[PDB]
Write a protein that binds this DNA or RNA. Sequence first.
RNA 1: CGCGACCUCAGAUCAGACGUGGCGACCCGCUGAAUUUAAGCAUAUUAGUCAGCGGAGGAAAAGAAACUAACCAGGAUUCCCUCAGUAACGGCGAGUGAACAGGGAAGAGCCCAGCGCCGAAUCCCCGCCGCGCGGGGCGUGGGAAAUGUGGCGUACGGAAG
RNA 2: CGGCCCCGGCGCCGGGCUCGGGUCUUCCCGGAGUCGGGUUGCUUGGGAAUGCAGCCCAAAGCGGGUGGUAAACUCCAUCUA
Lengths: 98, 203, 175, 205
Amino acid sequence: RYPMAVGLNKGHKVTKNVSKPRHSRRRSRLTNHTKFVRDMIREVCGFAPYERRAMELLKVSKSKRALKFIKKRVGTHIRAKRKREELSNVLAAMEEAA
Amino acid sequence: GAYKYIQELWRKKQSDVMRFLLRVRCWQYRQLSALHRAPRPTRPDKARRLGYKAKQGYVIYRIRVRRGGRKRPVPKGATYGKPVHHGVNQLKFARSLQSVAEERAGRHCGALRVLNSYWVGEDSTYKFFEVILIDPFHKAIRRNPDTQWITKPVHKHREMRGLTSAGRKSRGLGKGHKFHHTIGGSRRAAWRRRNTLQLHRYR
Amino acid sequence: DRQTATQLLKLAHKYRPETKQEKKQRLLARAEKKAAGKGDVPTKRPPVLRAGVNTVTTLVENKKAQLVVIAHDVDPIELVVFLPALCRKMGVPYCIIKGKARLGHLVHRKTCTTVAFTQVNSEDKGALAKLVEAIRTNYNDRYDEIRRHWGGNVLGPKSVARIAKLEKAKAKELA
Amino acid sequence: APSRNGMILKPHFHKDWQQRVDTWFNQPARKIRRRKARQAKARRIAPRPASGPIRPIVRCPTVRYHTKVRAGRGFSLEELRVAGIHKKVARTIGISVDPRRRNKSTESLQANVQRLKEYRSKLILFPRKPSAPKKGDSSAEELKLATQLTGPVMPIRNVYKKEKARVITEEEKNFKAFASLRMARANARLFGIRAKRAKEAAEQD
RNA sequence: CGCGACCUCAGAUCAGACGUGGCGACCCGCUGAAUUUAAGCAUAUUAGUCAGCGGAGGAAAAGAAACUAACCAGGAUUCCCUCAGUAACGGCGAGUGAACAGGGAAGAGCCCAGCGCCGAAUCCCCGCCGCGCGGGGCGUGGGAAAUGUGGCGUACGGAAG
RNA sequence: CGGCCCCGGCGCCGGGCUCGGGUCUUCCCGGAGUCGGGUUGCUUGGGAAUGCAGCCCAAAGCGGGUGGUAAACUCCAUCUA
Ligand SMILES: [Mg+2]
Ligand SMILES: [Mg+2]
Ligand SMILES: [Mg+2]
Ligand SMILES: [Mg+2]
Ligand SMILES: [Mg+2]
Ligand SMILES: [Mg+2]
Ligand SMILES: [Mg+2]
Ligand SMILES: [Mg+2]
Ligand SMILES: [Mg+2]
Ligand SMILES: [Mg+2]
Ligand SMILES: [Mg+2]
Ligand SMILES: [Mg+2]
Ligand SMILES: [Mg+2]
Ligand SMILES: [Mg+2]
Ligand SMILES: [Mg+2]
Ligand SMILES: [Mg+2]
Ligand SMILES: [Mg+2]
Ligand SMILES: [Mg+2]
Ligand SMILES: [Mg+2]
Ligand SMILES: [Mg+2]
Ligand SMILES: [Mg+2]
Ligand SMILES: [Mg+2]
């Protein structure tokens, strides 16, 4: 009924701005060229020692141990999840193929 | 072009192809002097993204520093003070090794201006850096309007005052709630501003 | 080898970058013949090789280079390690040669890293295609073997002679 | 040290303060310097008004001051685009531009573009030669005035909707109450808990 | 064996040019105690001060958010009044202690590395030629720097074709 | 107030550079031993550690930082070091 200072829907009622967000918010997006150069340098450099150890761990059914190892190597847990995902992807992309 | 490739290749400096190069270059730099002139930058992309241009008047120096924390110069480890100041062994310098490298380079060459620096190699006993110096009195730099700011006498010895990119980090400057130490200028300026008694005429 | 490299050099000697003297000459003659003949394009674009690692990379990425030649006397190897894999991915023929100064002399500079052949005359197209095949069968078709090959790991002769003495004395004891 | 009865005091005079004491004995001289600088700047820029760059309509962020409105730094790029003038020309026209500010409410967007249109309509600029368009034959005898004070075209004086008086409706006697605010606060506090309870109930089904 | 090119390098009283040191009231970087208070004293306070070292300018630093807030949002930095002796820190003892608002003084914004296009259209030096008072820059020709990357066009507020 | 001498700008007579705005179609869009984490010192009012530094571990591109109490799941706001 009446707009209240507290509640699920508080504050003075206004209309939203449908304007396009600024281009600085769009940063480090997946680009074709960037993905190409990254994938080209990845196969040239190979992998890191801890990356190879984690791939060996993923090859065995022990996955929580590899997650803990990655969380101990890199800083936070949210980075460890993404690293584990990338390692599983690179292990399942070409090693599963003939 | 290719600088993006070199950057994305140097980013993964733990692979074998890069580790071999870093080890060989560290071994090669260990035999040279503590301070010398590199005729061309080992990291061209890193020098370009710092402000190095392939033209006359820009010099590159390679300098090594001793890795490790500092020790108190007190004799026999005696401070003659309260126990809180008995920390002779485990003390850490406020400035970084890169910053003290830039400082040593600018002290050895006063006629040149330290622009920036970057890391090339390191080991257990040494850490190597490459610094960029500008000749403020060369005609190829004084005539270019984009680099005329390095000629003014206000930028004399930027490395000894923390104006470089390495010293700016150790100064503690920044904008946000995490940098309330030095609001305006330096932490000493903030201290002088917040610890002065304002006595107006009418009070 | 000393034969195919010299052949590639003799081929490149025809498409050398145009020097500054004759560049000023042609720029002075262009403004004169333009007012003389009143023509739009009286001089066809001359096919010339492209120098510089950035230019070579931007050409091979867009698949505009017919051939790539690389030097190996570069001090920082990282500026060059990425190029052979890129040419293998793009399918263009790449070849490594000895002497950046020798590569350099054609471009009238002290040091030149890489050179890309993009446009070739109709009468040199056959001579170029005759050598791109031998280059592909030497570098492109053997890329997997080159990537799997590990060099170095060679001990000194003073350390090989002693192990030879030991293996001889051991073989004389076994049989 | 203490006395019979008194407020406990903690004076911050334990430091060495007498060697850093700022006395304002140069305050009249500073005010005179500032006044002379203002006069010199206005005399040098006489055709342009003091505090030349027009400033937009700006609402205070915090809830303590969000009821009043104040001046700001510059107009947003969206407001410039709705006004129809280029971004870089507004600076030499005399319009301060703030590229960092965003626009979240059309209610403020329309007010800002209206202020910009009013400034543009009231603006009269001088050319080098009469060959420049968007002007008149005579510049109103120096525009009837050379310099303006305390805002270029208009200050940010507050206006308020009147809502003078009206007849009370029927259900207004039992429309709102303190219980309404109490229920609103209770729902805002127990919103997620009820959702989790409904989820765990539908789980059993 | 020699020659030549490149690359890491050495010497000169080579041609031209630059730094040293002094003052240091104000400013910047480092480390730097104790007397005192805590009615004693170790944590703490004195103090991130004094002393010590390194630098410049009439100002220096700062300065265009990897910001503040959680509502009707604001918008570089610097200084003043308030916030405030407050939030908070502390043998939670002595004591220490900000910040965001808001109102004022002033308010100027931009560049580059990268990504791409331009036959390197770029820059330094040398010498004769056409110019002005007290002397330095405009047009011409060769010696170097530079393709391991000059310069215009570009900068997150998008840009290019 | 006058007269005299010296210095600096505002208007006018040679010389060298010199396409902006909007819609549409196509492409491009980023700073690394760095962030962050562990640990040890100094410092801060900053408290499951505000900032700096030494050693070790050391990345991503629907990513990263911040949202003042550490940790997991989800969403939101702001910025692009
Ligand atoms: Mg993002
Ligand atoms: Mg040189
Ligand atoms: Mg003593
Ligand atoms: Mg600065
Ligand atoms: Mg009083
Ligand atoms: Mg008494
Ligand atoms: Mg006593
Ligand atoms: Mg005592
Ligand atoms: Mg005292
Ligand atoms: Mg202290
Ligand atoms: Mg002192
Ligand atoms: Mg000095
Ligand atoms: Mg002076
Ligand atoms: Mg910015
Ligand atoms: Mg009070
Ligand atoms: Mg403490
Ligand atoms: Mg107290
Ligand atoms: Mg204190
Ligand atoms: Mg993240
Ligand atoms: Mg985010
Ligand atoms: Mg949160
Ligand atoms: Mg929290």
